[PDB]
């Protein structure tokens, strides 16, 4: 993807994280686990919902065909009428399939962007207090219990402390 996170430096998703789209996995002396980041997740749910609604509404007003009948010596206008109706269906079919194609691509990259931004957000807190492993993980130089892990998810990781 465009942002390099999803199926990128972070190789794969987590079957074990069911409470959200993006989050953290910690592991220390006292155990390990998954925790969804609510803020980024909710942001994504809002983005995509609006998108789906935006798409549905833009297509709302669109061509509608009516039955019109023509006798045996009105073949030109019968034909004209058919082309007109067919023409608009083709135009609106194209509009729909393109929109879906284009926005689908934007949606995947959007998720990729949110994962990366979350990663950078964490990276910028830890700074030189942890090793960047290259895979989405940071290995701490100091013991980091559940309180410590919580502060990283908090946004509260006290860098001058460690």
């Amino acid at each position: 993807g465009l942002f390099g996170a999803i199926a990128g430096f972070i190789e794969g998703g987590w079957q074990g994280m069911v409470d959200g789209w993006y989050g953290y996995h910690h592991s220390n002396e006292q155990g390990s686990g998954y925790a969804a980041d609510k803020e980024s997740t909710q942001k994504a749910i809002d983005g995509v919902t609006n998108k789906v609604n935006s798409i549905i509404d833009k297509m709302n007003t669109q061509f509608e065909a009516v039955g019109r009948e023509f006798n045996n010596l009105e073949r030109r206008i019968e034909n004209l009428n058919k082309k007109m109706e067919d023409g608009f269906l083709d135009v609106w079919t194209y509009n729909a399939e393109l929109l879906v194609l284009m926005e689908n691509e934007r949606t995947l990259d959007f998720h990729d962007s949110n994962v990366k931004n979350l990663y950078d957000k964490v990276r910028l807190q830890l700074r030189d207090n942890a090793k960047e492993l290259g895979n989405g993980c940071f290995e701490f130089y100091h013991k980091c219990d559940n309180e410590c892990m919580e502060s990283v998810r908090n946004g509260t990781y006290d860098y001058p402390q460690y």
């Binding site: 794969g12 592991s27 399939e97």
Partner: protein, 321 residues
């Protein structure tokens, strides 16, 4: 000790297309195209469609004898007519401005039939021998029920001078016709007079028909032809007929009580004994989807028609192996 950033995965197989890549598997998605219908013609908002079955708008409105089902039909939501209904113009001919009339019906939900000229009233002409073998009812030669085929009495067709005033609040659909005879002998035989005409007049209408004689291939066992005309008589306007032969007079004319949204749907299908909020010529639709691909011509509160086979939006992210 470490903390990792990652993203959701699941067992979903749903796939979406993008511009650069097809069949991408995603955790979540949303189908927005309705691909199914019940396969039946249905009531629309509880209101039954007028189903002509084998009859045609012409058969119905002139009152073909085999379209007896459709006398005084109630209010309809939409009308359903086959592609080649057998019971059309039983006595061969033409229906003048037929398509413009059919178009008028797309704005109409209910007719109320009323008698403007009684059959009894034709005292100076014979009004009950006006039938043909082409339009047969119950084994006996009959004719379009809504119009009277007037012929001569005691070898004489005196000039007809008749006038109806529309005192109803409604627009009135008046129907009439002219008969084209096979030959000069046939003309004299039926109507006595050799040179005839029908002058019709309203506030707008200024018609005068004459019979065209020609030798024609038999259709439905007859080489003679009936050309049918119509008008909308406005309220408080009067229509004026005058003829000395070949006049097919109105008996009943239709009152236009309800105007509104309707359509002439074209389907071979019959009634399904069902109800819907959205109908197509192939069957009814029930969905919340913004799109469908069943058939372009629909009536009711429907999704938008597209020729797509598949429309699926990614909501979730790229799902992992």
């Amino acid at each position: 000790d470490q903390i990792c950033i990652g993203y959701h995965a699941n067992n979903s197989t749903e796939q979406v297309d993008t511009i650069m890549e097809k069949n991408v598997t995603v955790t979540h998605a949303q189908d927005i195209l309705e691909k199914t219908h019940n396969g039946k013609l249905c009531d629309l908002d509880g209101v039954k469609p007028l189903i002509l079955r084998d009859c045609s708008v012409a058969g119905w409105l002139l009152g073909n004898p085999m379209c007896d089902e459709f006398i005084n039909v109630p209010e309809w939501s939409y009308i359903v007519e086959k592609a080649n209904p057998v019971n059309d113009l039983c006595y061969p001919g033409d229906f003048n401005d037929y398509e413009e009339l059919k178009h008028l019906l797309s704005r109409i939900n209910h007719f109320e039939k009323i008698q403007i000229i009684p059959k009894s009233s034709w005292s100076s002409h014979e009004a009950s021998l006006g039938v043909s073998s082409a339009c047969p009812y119950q084994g006996k030669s009959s004719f379009f029920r809504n119009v009277v085929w007037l012929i001569k009495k005691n070898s004489t067709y005196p000039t007809i001078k008749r006038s109806y005033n529309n005192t109803n609040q409604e627009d009135l659909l008046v129907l009439w016709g002219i008969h084209h005879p096979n030959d000069a002998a046939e003309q004299t035989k039926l109507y006595q007079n050799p040179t005839t005409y029908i002058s019709v007049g309203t506030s707008t209408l200024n018609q005068r028909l004459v019979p065209r004689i020609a030798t024609r291939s038999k259709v439905n066992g007859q080489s003679g032809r009936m050309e049918f005309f119509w008008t909308i008589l406005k309220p408080n306007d009067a229509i004026n007929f005058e003829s000395n032969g070949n006049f097919i007079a109105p008996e009943y004319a239709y009152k236009i009580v309800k105007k509104g949204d309707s359509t002439i749907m074209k389907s071979e299908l019959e009634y399904g004994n069902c109800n819907t909020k959205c109908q197509t010529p192939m069957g009814a639709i029930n969905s919340s989807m913004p799109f469908h691909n069943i058939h372009p011509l629909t009536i009711g509160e429907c999704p938008k028609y597209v020729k797509s086979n598949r429309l699926v939006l990614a909501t979730g992210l790229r799902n992992s192996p």
